[PDB]
Design a protein around this ligand. Structure first.
Ligand SMILES: [Co+2]
Ligand SMILES: [Co+2]
Ligand SMILES: [Co+2]
Length: 105
């Protein structure tokens, strides 16, 4: 993957996350500030998504941990656990808001 391709795929991801939040009507606020996509819950907790363009990775910070994802099999896959980004993001949103956002279907 080159940088230009990474940008296309990461833009598709960010837009997918935003569209699925809108679709769901969930009370999740989102703000893209360049490389950053911050999700904010009513309880004032956040999830922070960052693009690391030279590594061609998307990173996710939860309250406890950081996760780094490579694009593999048409999906974003955690490079230590092998978990899929969007499934993991759904689970995190449910914990911090008790609202369901399905990003995969
Ligand atoms: Co190419
Ligand atoms: Co609906
Ligand atoms: Co408030």
């Amino acid at each position: 993957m080159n940088d230009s391709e990474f940008i296309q795929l990461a833009d598709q991801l960010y837009q997918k996350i935003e569209e699925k939040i809108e679709e769901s009507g969930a009370d999740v606020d989102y703000d893209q500030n360049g490389s950053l996509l911050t999700l904010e819950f009513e309880n004032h907790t956040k999830l922070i998504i960052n693009r690391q363009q030279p590594l061609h990775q998307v990173w996710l910070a939860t309250l406890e941990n950081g996760h780094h994802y490579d694009y593999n099999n048409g999906k974003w896959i955690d490079d230590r656990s092998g978990d899929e980004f969007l499934t993991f993001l759904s689970a995190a949103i449910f914990k911090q808001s008790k609202e369901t956002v399905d990003f995969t279907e």
